[PDB]
Structure formats: C-alpha cells, structure tokens
C-alpha cells in the first residue's frame, strides 16, 4: 500500500483465493499498461504461489483457467 | 544496492542506468525499472524475466528504452535513447523482495 | 493467466 507486484507472494497458510485477490488488487493499483499487467500476471501469478500450491498449479499444465486453478487448490 | 547513470541531457539525448545489486536480488526471476516524477505515482516502465530473457515495456518507452540483465556481474541496466522532456523523473530498479533503493535522477531539457 | 483474465474473473 503501495506495494510492487513483484513483492506479492502467497503465504504458507494463505488460501490461494486470498493470494489471487491480493495479487489482483496490487496489480490494479500499479501504474502500468494492460500489456505490462498481462506480462506480470503470466510471469508472476503461478511462480509466486507457495511451493505446495505451485506443485498443484504446474501439474494442471499451461493454459489452465483461473476457475480450474481455484478448483485444484 | 547501487543505482547510477542518471543526469542532465538535452532532448534526443541518451543515458544508461545501472542497478548493481547483491546475489539475493539477482535470484529474482523478474526485475523491473520504475519511473517516479514529482507529485505522481510510480510507473512500471520496463521488466525482464530470467531464463528466456523475455521483456515488456510501457507504451511511452517502446523503441527507445532497453532493459538488460548481466547475471555474470549482477547488474541490471536501462538503456535510454531519444530522451524526451516528459522522461524527467527518478528511476528505481526492483526485484521480488528487494528493498527500494535511492533511485537515480534523469533530467531532460527542452 | 493474463491480467484480462483477472478483470473478467472479479468484474
């Protein structure tokens, strides 16, 4: 507040739905183009999830929807 | 963390910013340059990711600025070409979990 | 996931 999108990481006990909401709000607050925000989400969202969730999300493979990610965790 | 390369230049001029940092900074997959002009919120203008070396730029810096990372020296760069008066601001480098630095001032006349 | 996906998901 203001936090860089680079610093948003899922806590060890943080539910994935809470982390995605925190990530979304932080990125909304960032002063950047839609292109930069898209690149940031593609690069950081799964990468900055906690190791337990990251194993689950990566197993879904590329192109998984947010709905599918929510129903996996 | 050492940020430098800023200074006073005329419109159409060039500068190369350097972000010399620790190994911990360079463990971050994503690194970015932020621009902050007086009385304005900071803007995410350029970013790079480790491995494939993919980059992204804000529309206001396309075809003028280039972000590069030297993993052998742990230095993040921002090559700024065809500088415009609107580029006048404090420039900051950022990585995941990194402490903000002092920034470096870029001032463009005309 | 893109930022546009997040905008569409949350509204």
Where along chain A do its domains lie?
Answer: 1-73
CB contact under 8 A, C5 and A41: yes
Is-contact C9 C1, C-beta < 8 A? no
State the CB neighbour count (10 A cutoff) for residue A61: 8
Contacts of B73 (CB under 8 A, 6+ apart): B20
Helix (H, G, I), strand (E, B) or coil at C3: helix
What is B19-88 written as a DSSP string? EE--TTGGG-SEEEEEEE-TTS--EEEEEEETTT--EEE-GGGTTTEEEEEETTTTEEEEEE-S--GGG-
**Which domains, from first to last, does chain B contain?**
1-110 (2.60.40.10)
Contacts of B19 (CB under 8 A, 6+ apart): B1, B2, B3, B31, B33, B75, B76, B77, B78, B93, B101
State the CB neighbour count (10 A cutoff) for residue A69: 21
Q: What is the CA radius of gyration of chain C?
A: 5
Among the residues of C1-11, which ranges form H helices? 3-10
The length of chain B in residues reads 110
CB contact under 8 A, A38 and C9: no
Q: CATH number of the domain at A1-73, out of 1.10.3210.10, 1.10.1200.30, 3.60.150.10, 1.20.1290.10? A: 1.10.1200.30
Report the candidate in B44, B59, B58 with the shortest Cα–Cα distance to residue A30: B44
Is-contact B9 B83, C-beta < 8 A? yes
Chain A residues close to B31, C-beta within 8 Å: 6
CB contact under 8 A, C5 and A21: no
Is-contact B66 B1, C-beta < 8 A? no
CA distances, A42 to each of A5, A21, A45, A62, B65 (Å): 12, 15, 6, 10, 22
> Quick one: resolution in A?
1.6
Report the candidate in B64, B13, B96 with the shortest Cα–Cα distance to residue A48: B96
Distance CA B102, CA A71 (A): 43
Distance CA B105, CA A37 (A): 25
């Amino acid at each position: 507040s203001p936090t860089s999108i680079l610093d948003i990481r899922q806590g060890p006990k943080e539910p994935f739905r809470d982390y995605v909401d925190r990530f979304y709000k932080t990125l909304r607050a960032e002063q950047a183009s839609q292109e930069v925000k898209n690149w940031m989400t593609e690069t950081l969202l799964v990468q900055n999830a906690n190791p337990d969730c990251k194993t689950i999300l990566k197993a879904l493979g590329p192109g998984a929807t947010l709905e599918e990610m929510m129903t996996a965790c | 963390l050492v940020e430098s390369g800023g200074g006073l230049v005329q419109a159409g001029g060039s500068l190369r910013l350097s972000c010399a940092a620790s190994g911990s900074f360079f463990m971050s997959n994503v690194m970015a340059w932020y621009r902050q002009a007086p009385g304005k919120a900071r803007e995410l203008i350029a970013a790079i990711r480790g491995g494939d070396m993919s980059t992204v730029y804000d529309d206001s810096v396309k075809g003028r600025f280039t972000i590069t990372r030297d993993d052998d020296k742990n230095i993040l760069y921002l090559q700024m070409n065809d500088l415009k008066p609107e580029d006048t601001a404090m420039y900051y480098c950022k990585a995941s979990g990194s402490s903000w630095g002092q920034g470096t001032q870029v001032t463009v006349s005309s | 996931i893109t930022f546009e996906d997040l905008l569409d998901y949350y509204g």
